[PDB]
């Protein structure tokens, strides 16, 4: 049976990026829908669970994407709710690539740390977006003491609360309104992630290269000026004075490989659920 991926995008039309990577992940056919909502996705899921039986079931799978993670999560939960008993197919959530990017970034940092981040302070600057929040969740699941930072405490605390509830972790929040406050927030940190919006610097070179406690820095912004000063986006563990740096393009190379590999896994069973935790498990295998 041919491997059929059904792409449910919350934006008006389905992401081209997700189509290419889906085909390179081994889907034989990709059929995409835009404007997917919790109310209309049920009948789409019916088409995946009532059309094939037994051995053939695993050859259909669902990918949920779009530009708004909370909208994607609402659809993803509606997909899982529609399943019952054996009437189910594997599914994946990766709105805007936030799951695969966060998983690649954290997996790379944890590996470079020696395999454990337990008990150590990790700071996520501008952590209030989807990539920062998923990064915070995975770091916290690994035992790091995570501080999720943003320009406003109310928004940072809201992000921490959301991560904490979904992932049953205990991320804390902090307000860092400017470069000075971001530079203070990383003092004593062992791992620093910059998860700011595209094209913005958050942590100048002098604010991390002289902090003895910092082991690893990682930056998800690929567009100059980079989130972290004094690195190149292609850096993938490059040493700077006994610290190691992961730039956005180095992280993004793993993300692509990981995203493709997740797609392939969807067709190996009818029971996969690929959200942050399961995507991160594979990221650690591949990093």
Ligand X SMILES: C[C@@H]1Nc2nc(N)[nH]c(=O)c2N2CN(c3ccc(C[C@H](O)[C@H](O)[C@H](O)CO[C@H]4O[C@H](COP(=O)(O)O[C@@H](CCC(=O)O)C(=O)O)[C@@H](O)[C@H]4O)cc3)[C@H](C)[C@@H]12
- The residue (of 3 and 71) whose beta carbon lies closer to ligand NAP is 71
Residues 6+ apart with CB under 8 A from 20: none
The reply on whether position 232 binds a copy of itself by CB under 8 A is: no
The DSSP secondary-structure symbol of 84 reads B
Residue 151 preceded by cis peptide, ω within 30: no
The residue (of 257 and 265) whose beta carbon lies closer to ligand X is 257
Instruction: State yes or no: residue 153 binds a copy of itself (CB under 8 A).
Output: no
Least distance in angstroms from the C-beta of 53 to ligand NAP: 12
**263 forms part of the interface with a copy of itself (CB under 8 A):** no
Q: How far is the CB of 228 from ligand NAP (least distance, A)?
A: 11
Measured CA to CA, the distance from residue 32 to residue 259 in angstroms comes to 17
Which residue shows structure tokens 């650690």? 284
| DSSP helix/strand/coil, 123 | strand
| CA-CA-CA-CA dihedral for 276, 21, 37, 31, to nearest 10 | -140
Which residues of the shown chain bind ligand NAP in the complex (CB under 6 A)?
A: 67, 96-98, 101, 126, 128-132, 150-152, 155-156, 195-198, 200, 220-222, 248, 251-252, 255
Contact 87, 50 (CB under 8 A): yes
Pick what 4 binds: ligand NAP, a copy of itself, ligand X, none; C-beta below 5 to 8 Å, kind-dependent.
Answer: a copy of itself
With tokens 């972290």, the residue in question is 228
Pick 180 or 198: Cβ nearer ligand NAP: 198
For residue 51, the minimal CB distance to ligand NAP (Å) is 9
Binds a copy of itself by CB under 8 A, chosen from 37, 51, 116, 170: 51
**Shortest CB 47 distance to a copy of itself, Å:** 3
In whole angstroms, how far apart are CA 33 and each of 8, 37, 39, 71? 5, 10, 14, 14
29 contacts a copy of itself (rule: CB under 8 A)? yes
């Amino acid at each position: 049976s041919k491997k059929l991926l059904f792409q449910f995008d919350t934006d008006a039309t389905p992401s081209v990026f997700d189509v290419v990577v889906g085909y390179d992940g081994g889907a034989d056919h990709i059929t995409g829908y835009g404007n997917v909502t919790p109310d209309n996705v049920g009948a789409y899921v019916d088409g995946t669970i009532y059309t094939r039986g037994g051995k053939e079931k695993q050859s259909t799978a669902i990918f949920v994407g779009g530009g708004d993670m909370a909208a994607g999560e609402r659809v993803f939960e509606a997909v899982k709710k529609r399943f019952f008993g054996p009437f189910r197919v594997s599914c994946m959530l990766d709105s805007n690539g936030s799951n695969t990017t966060a998983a690649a970034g954290v997996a790379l940092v944890v590996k470079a740390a020696g395999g454990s981040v337990k008990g150590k302070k990790a700071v996520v600057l501008a952590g209030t977006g989807p990539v920062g929040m998923r990064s915070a969740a995975l770091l916290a699941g690994e035992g790091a003491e995570v501080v999720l930072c943003g320009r406003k405490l109310d928004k940072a605390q809201a992000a921490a609360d959301s991560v904490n509830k979904r992932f049953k972790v205990n991320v804390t929040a902090a307000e860092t309104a400017d470069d000075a406050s971001r530079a203070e927030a990383v003092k004593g940190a062992h791992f620093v992630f910059t998860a700011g919006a595209i094209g913005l610097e958050l942590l100048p070179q002098a604010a991390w290269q002289n902090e003895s406690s910092i082991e690893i820095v990682a930056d998800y912004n690929a567009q100059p000026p980079l989130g972290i000063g004094g690195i190149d986006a292609t850096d993938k563990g490059k040493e700077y004075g006994g610290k190691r740096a992961f730039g956005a393009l180095g992280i993004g190379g793993l993300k692509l490989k990981l995203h493709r590999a997740c797609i392939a896994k969807l067709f190996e069973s009818s029971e996969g659920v690929f959200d942050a935790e399961e995507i991160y498990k594979l990221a650690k295998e591949m990093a």
